Structure formats: C-alpha cells, structure tokens
C-alpha cells in the first residue's frame, strides 16, 4: 500500500472487514485520509483539503505539530510507554502543570477517553458524597447512562436525571431532592447561553452543597485557552480531553481534593491510564497554547471564517444565525437539510467542513486556509440555492423563534420554552424522583446503605 491507492478501493476493502456503514462511511465524506499537515489533509489519491473538523474536535494545534510529535517521540524512543509504576515523571509534571493552570484543579487523575473521564466524574461524585443521583445534560459519551441523560427526565436504573439545560428545572429539582444529588454534570453550550448562565448554575449548586462538574471534553481548549472554567465559571470538577494531547488519546479529570481523593474507594481503574507518551504530548500542547499570540491568532482566524460565512449567507438572503466562541462556532439555518447539503457540496471544492454545523479551526490556520474555505462555502451555497430551492429560502429575514427553540431541543436536548408542557414535564419528573421506590437503584461503589 505504498503507492497507487484509491479512495474507492480502500473504502470497499474496509467494508469487508471493519467499516460500520453509517458511522464509518455514509457520514464521513467518503475520501480516505492518508496524511495531515497543519490546516490541511491529503487523501490517498493526493487530493488536498482544508480541515474544519479537527477530527471531531480532538485536534487543537493542527496536524503533525512538531512540538507535540517530538515530545511523544522522545518519550517512546528514549524512555518507554508504560511502566510497573502507574506514576511517572511526565505524569507528575503534567499534573503539577494542570494544578497551577486551573483554580478548580487541586488534584488531577487521567484516563484514555472522554466517555471514561465523565464516567469517572460521576463515580467520584457518588463515592465522595455518599449520594445517589446525577443531574445531567449535554452529551457525555456513548455509555447507556450518558446517552439516556441527554433527554429530560429520570432513569431510575442509572440514577441520572436529565434537566435539559433548563435553569428553572434544576432549581426546583435541587429544592425538592437536592440532598440526594451527588453532582451536576453539564456540557457547556455556548451558542444559546452566556458565561453568566453557568456562573449562576455553579452558585445554585454550591448553595445546596452539590458538586458542580463541567464536562469540557469538547470546550476545554475551544471556549478559551482554559475552557469555560477559565472564562470565570467556578467548578468542583472539570473533565477535559479533546485537544488535550492534540489528537492522541488522553483525558484529565481535575477537581477539588476531597472529590478526587475518592478514587481508591470508587473502584475506578484502567491499565492504560498510566500510559506516559500522551502526557508528554499534553505538556507540549500547553506550551504551545501558552505561547504569547498563538491563541489570539487562532481566534482571529475563527472570527475571519465565521464572519465570512455570515456574510456569504446573508448576501444570498438565507436566514442565518452565526454565533458561539471563535474556535467552536455554530451556523443555524431555517432547516436541517440546507446546511448538510452545503457542507457536502463544499467537499467537491477542497474543504472538509464539519457536517453538524460547528466549525473548528486550529492554531495552525493562516488566512490562506480560511479564505480557501470561504471560497468553497461561497461556491457551495450558490450551487445548493440553484439546485435545491425547496430547502434554500433566499428572501431574507431572521430565524423564527420557533426554529431557534426547536433546534435547541433537537440539537442538544435544551428545553427552553416556558409553556405548559415543559412545566408539566418538570413537575412530572420531580414527582417520579421524589415518590420513587428507593429499593430500585443503580449499582453504587461503594454501597450506599
């Protein structure tokens, strides 16, 4: 396979042995990438593309950042990968770095994935508090309890209440049964909500002595160089992973000492948590992001792309809302088909836009890469308007309140209406928690008797 490969040839070859049809092919754009460098990808046939996917967000610096590659390589080649001691010098150095960098970080422990990191957060909160329930919203991974918690309501078998980014719901739940709540675990969403919304949520949780835990597996290095926490939101636990080691598998659970101290009795482990090279890569990432001007230039490139996309859509008369942080901004359109069609078509013009509508520049981006992506977006939007007028309204105006409320529920389970059904759902859920048969409960470690 050293030359003369084709996208279609290897896709077919992958279908025979490993490809999940929808997850691996139908959803991915159907070229197969052979290398990356900075802001650009190269497929096995030599086609080049500007990358706005960041590999689903795990990359923050760009592909093959040399500081990260050197630090990973030195560890692997000159020292080793995994030792009989779970402690290592790079693990200690990184934990010290993280504790100095974050006011919420008094102690830090590590794992391989965001799904395991947020599971660790719930396990630690339960073991530390001796309480049963987790109140959750936002995506936390692919385990059942995480997936089910994105929907508002109560899953008694997992001990998770979903509260749908609804401030009122959370306050009423804490008032009604907060003494049973081991923690709140929320993935910050920054298109619909401001920093103050999360500051008030921390304050609410602290008034009930409930740990406030932010899942910033996604936002950790894209809401700002220190995540949402670094914008002034206090936290008892923060989980990070995407960007942490620039695409290499590493997650960090950082938090206040009495919660992290519950590790031993929580039963958390994992034979790869000790893996050393990724921790050297993470310290290289932190050195790059803390270099003066780097993060500022990246945000300028994200603003350049977002503003250009807004102009292209507004100039064509397509109703649109472009918002959010510069390094993780969303584009909302009147319907869900229009964006996907544009993003797909733009692949023909040499750019990998992220299908879901959140674009993710990296620090390696320069203006030529942004402007190549705008050229492709401009051409793709014009073609979709021409070919698919049934989904491409061009008569101006703003998104309706209906669409914005519906999209929040659809996209992230945010229940943002103050109508009777939402308030009825709030009261039903609280009733189901309060009047429950308490003999039916998830497995708790340690047991809560």
User: Residues 271 to 330: which contact a copy of itself by CB under 8 A?
Assistant: 271-272, 274-275, 277
Closest distance between ligand PLP and the C-beta of residue 247, in Å?
11
- What whole-number distance in Å separates Cα of residue 63 and Cα of residue 54? 9
**Quick check: 340 and 278 in contact, CB under 8 A?**
no
141 lines the binding site for ligand PLP (CB under 6 A): yes
101 lines the binding site for a copy of itself (CB under 8 A): no
**Quick check: 219 and 226 in contact, CB under 8 A?**
no
- DSSP characters over 204-232: HHHHTT--EEEE-TTTTTTSSTTTTGGGT
Among residues 185, 205, 195, 198, the alpha carbon closest in space to that of 140 is found at 185
- What whole-number distance in Å separates Cα of residue 82 and Cα of residue 406? 48
Residue of 208, 272, 349, 412 interacting with ligand PLP (CB under 6 A): 272
Closest distance between ligand PLP and the C-beta of residue 334, in Å?
26
What does the per-residue mask of binding to a copy of itself show for 39-58, with x meaning CB under 8 A? --x-xx------x-x-xxxx
Q: Which residue is nearest to ligand PLP (CB)?
A: 114
Q: Toward ligand PLP, which CB reaches closer, 123 or 304?
A: 123
Among residues 123, 325, 93, 121, the alpha carbon closest in space to that of 239 is found at 121
Closest distance between ligand PLP and the C-beta of residue 119, in Å?
9
Choose the contact partner of 424 out of ligand PLP, a copy of itself, none; CB within 5 to 8 A by kind: none
Closest distance between ligand PLP and the C-beta of residue 141, in Å?
4
State the CB neighbour count (10 A cutoff) for residue 354. Answer: 18
Retrieve residue 411's tokens: 């996209």
Q: Candidates 134-142, 199-207, 304-312, 365-373 — which segment interacts with ligand PLP by CB under 6 A?
A: 134-142
Q: What is the DSSP letter of 22?
A: I
Closest distance between a copy of itself and the C-beta of residue 176, in Å?
23
Closest distance between ligand PLP and the C-beta of residue 81, in Å?
14
429 lines the binding site for a copy of itself (CB under 8 A): no
- Mapping DSSP to helix (H, G, I), strand (E, B) and coil, where does residue 348 land? coil
Q: Candidates 133-141, 197-205, 395-403, 406-414 — which segment interacts with ligand PLP by CB under 6 A?
A: 133-141
Residue of 232, 270, 350, 393 interacting with a copy of itself (CB under 8 A): 270
Q: Candidates 145-153, 221-229, 333-341, 375-383 — which segment interacts with a copy of itself by CB under 8 A?
A: 145-153
Residue of 110, 218, 263, 352 interacting with ligand PLP (CB under 6 A): 218
Strand order in the sheet with 329-332: 321-323, 329-332, 358-359
Cβ-in-10-Å burial (0-12, 13-18, 19+) of 113 comes to middle
Cβ-in-10-Å burial (0-12, 13-18, 19+) of 316 comes to middle
Residue of 34, 42, 47, 113 interacting with ligand PLP (CB under 6 A): 113
Strand order in the sheet with 133-137: 107-111, 251-255, 237-240, 212-215, 181-186, 133-137, 160-162, 153-155
Task: Enumerate binding residues for ligand PLP (CB under 6 A).
Answer: 113-115, 118, 138-141, 187, 215, 217-218, 241-242, 270-272
């Amino acid at each position: 396979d050293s030359a003369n490969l084709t996208n279609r040839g290897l896709v077919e070859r992958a279908r025979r042995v490993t490809a999940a049809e929808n997850y691996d092919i139908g959803t991915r754009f159907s070229a197969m990438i052979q290398s990356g460098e900075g802001a650009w990808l190269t497929d096995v046939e030599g086609n080049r593309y500007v990358d706005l996917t960041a590999s689903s967000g795990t990359i923050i610096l760009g592909h093959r950042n040399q500081a990260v590659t050197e630090a990973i390589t030195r560890q692997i080649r000159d020292f080793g990968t995994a030792f009989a001691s779970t402690l290592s010098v790079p693990r200690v150095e990184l934990a010290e770095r993280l504790c100095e960098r974050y006011e919420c970080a008094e102690k830090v422990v590590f794992h391989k994935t965001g799904s395991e990191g947020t599971a660790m957060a719930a396990r630690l909160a339960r073991a530390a508090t001796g309480r049963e329930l987790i109140l959750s919203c936002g995506y936390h991974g692919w385990h059942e309890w995480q997936l089910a918690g994105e929907t508002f309501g109560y899953q008694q078998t997992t001990g998770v209440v979903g509260f749908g980014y609804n401030e009122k719901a959370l306050a009423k739940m804490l008032e009604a049964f907060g003494n049973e709540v081991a923690g709140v675990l929320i993935s910050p969403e920054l298109l619909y909500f401001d920093v103050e919304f999360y500051q008030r949520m921390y304050a609410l949780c602290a008034r009930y002595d409930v740990p406030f835990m932010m899942d910033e597996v996604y936002t950790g290095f894209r809401a700002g160089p220190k995540g949402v926490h670094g914008l002034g939101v206090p936290a008892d636990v923060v989980v990070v992973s995407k960007g942490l080691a620039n695409g290499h598998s590493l997650a960090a659970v950082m938090g206040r000492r009495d919660i992290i101290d519950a590790y031993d009795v929580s039963g958390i482990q994992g034979t790869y948590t000790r893996e050393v090279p990724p921790m050297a890569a993470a310290m290289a990432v932190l050195d790059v992001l803390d270099t003066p001007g780097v993060y500022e230039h990246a945000e300028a490139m994200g603003r350049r792309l977002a503003d250009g996309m807004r102009e292209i859509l507004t100039g064509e008369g397509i109703p649109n809302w472009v918002g959010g942080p510069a390094l993780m901004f969303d584009t909302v359109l009147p319907n869900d088909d229009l964006g996907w069609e544009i993003y797909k078509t733009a692949h023909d013009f040499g750019v990998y836009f992220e299908d879901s509508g959140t674009q993710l520049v990296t620090t390696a981006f320069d203006e030529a890469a942004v402007d190549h992506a705008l050229t492709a977006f401009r051409k793709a939007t014009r073609q979709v308007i021409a070919d698919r007028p049934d989904i491409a309204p061009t008569s101006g105006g703003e998104l309706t309140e209906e669409r914005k409320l519906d999209f929040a529920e659809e996209a992230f389970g945010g229940l943002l209406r103050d109508d009777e059904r939402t308030n009825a759902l709030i009261d039903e859920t609280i009733e189901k928690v309060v009047n429950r048969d308490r003999s039916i409960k998830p497995v708790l470690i340690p047991a809560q008797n």
